Amino acid sequence: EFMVSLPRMVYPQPKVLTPCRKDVLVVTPWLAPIVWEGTFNIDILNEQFRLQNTTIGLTVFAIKKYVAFLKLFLETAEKHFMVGHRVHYYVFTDQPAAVPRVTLGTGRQLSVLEVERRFLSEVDYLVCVDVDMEFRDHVGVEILTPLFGTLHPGFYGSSREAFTYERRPQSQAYIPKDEGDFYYLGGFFGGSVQEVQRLTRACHQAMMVDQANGIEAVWHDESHLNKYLLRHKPTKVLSPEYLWDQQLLGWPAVLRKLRFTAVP
Numbered sequence: 001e002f003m004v005s006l007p008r009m010v011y012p013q014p015k016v017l018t019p020c021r022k023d024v025l026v027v028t029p030w031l032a033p034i035v036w037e038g039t040f041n042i043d044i045l046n047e048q049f050r051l052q053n054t055t056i057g058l059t060v061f062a063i064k065k066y067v068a069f070l071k072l073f074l075e076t077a078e079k080h081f082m083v084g085h086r087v088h089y090y091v092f093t094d095q096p097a098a099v100p101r102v103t104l105g106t107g108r109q110l111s112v113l114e115v116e117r118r119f120l121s122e123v124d125y126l127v128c129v130d131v132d133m134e135f136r137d138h139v140g141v142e143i144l145t146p147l148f149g150t151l152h153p154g155f156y157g158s159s160r161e162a163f164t165y166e167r168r169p170q171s172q173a174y175i176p177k178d179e180g181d182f183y184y185l186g187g188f189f190g191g192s193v194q195e196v197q198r199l200t201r202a203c204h205q206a207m208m209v210d211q212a213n214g215i216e217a218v219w220h221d222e223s224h225l226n227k228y229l230l231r232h233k234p235t236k237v238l239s240p241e242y243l244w245d246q247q248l249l250g251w252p253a254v255l256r257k258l259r260f261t262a263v264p
């Protein structure tokens with residue numbers, strides 16, 4: 001679509017002969033960037049997405065006891081998630097009345113869905129995450145792209161052989177030992193509404209086939225997500241900065257920021 005020009009901007013000149021990071025891979029073999037702190041200038045990116053009046057949908061499921069995590073989740077999202085852009089929260093829950101009344105910033109709204117074309121006409125991108133988490137730092141438009149996956153915090157430095165993919169050929173999520181790029185997290189993925197719906201559609205159909213064959217992938221949804229992203233390469237990959245567990249993994253030097261974390 002037609003994109004208006006950016007305005008004059010003053011910032012440090014990128015250095016061709018100076019790599020962003022020398023400690024991590026910042027681009028995949030299919031030329032998709034791997035998002036690490038230091039790889040992006042958020043001011044430039046904010047401009048690009050605001051000029052498009054981008055709206056980001058954030059979906060979360062809060063069933064049973066999980067509704068207790070909504071308060072902290074939404075409060076921290078208000079401080080760190082897509083601040084400055086239009087955000088539409090979609091809370092899928094079996095307890096609508098238990099959803100906490102969280103004060104939202106302007107241009108941000110929340111819909112409670114008790115437990116789709118609606119998404120296509122309301123938002124431009126969909127971000128799907130787990131509710132038992134909290135934002136601790138910036139999570140912005142640098143992640144937006146047609147399709148993105150997140151590097152699992154406990155496997156980013158492992159060989160594909162060690163990845164806990166589904167290894168049974170009887171499963172639709174099956175991935176042999178000599179295949180695999182990364183091990184993506186089932187708890188943080190997204191992209192354009194169209195790409196997210198295509199992925200969800202493919203995973204549901206795959207899980208149904210497994211269901212009929214009497215088999216369940218070792219890591220359920222996450223196993224199918226990994227098979228899907230192996231066959232349809234994400235256009236951006238998020239670093240472990242985007243989903244970390246400090247209590248369990250600490251704070252490695254490779255992580256300059258801990259943006260989204262598990263709640264102990």
Ligand SMILES: CC(=O)N[C@@H]1[C@@H](O)[C@H](O[C@@H]2O[C@H](CO)[C@H](O)[C@H](O)[C@H]2O[C@@H]2O[C@@H](C)[C@@H](O)[C@@H](O)[C@@H]2O)[C@@H](CO)O[C@H]1O
Binds near residue numbers: 153154219245
């Ligand atoms: C090789 C090894 O030691 N693997 C450990 C991982 O299994 C742990 O993460 C868990 O990974 C499985 C898939 O293999 C699945 O994704 C689980 O949801 C995941 O555990 C969750 O996410 C973690 C980051 C923690 O927040 C945990 O509390 C969650 O229940 C990781 C983390 O425990 O450690 C590796 O050692």
Ligand SMILES: [Cl-]
Binds near residue numbers: 061
């Ligand atoms: Cl979700």
Ligand SMILES: [Hg+2]
Binds near residue numbers: 021
């Ligand atoms: Hg850089």
Ligand SMILES: [Hg+2]
Binds near residue numbers: 059126127128196
């Ligand atoms: Hg979603």
Ligand SMILES: [Hg+2]
Binds near residue numbers: 224225
């Ligand atoms: Hg899938």
Ligand SMILES: [Hg+2]
Binds near residue numbers: 221
């Ligand atoms: Hg999936």
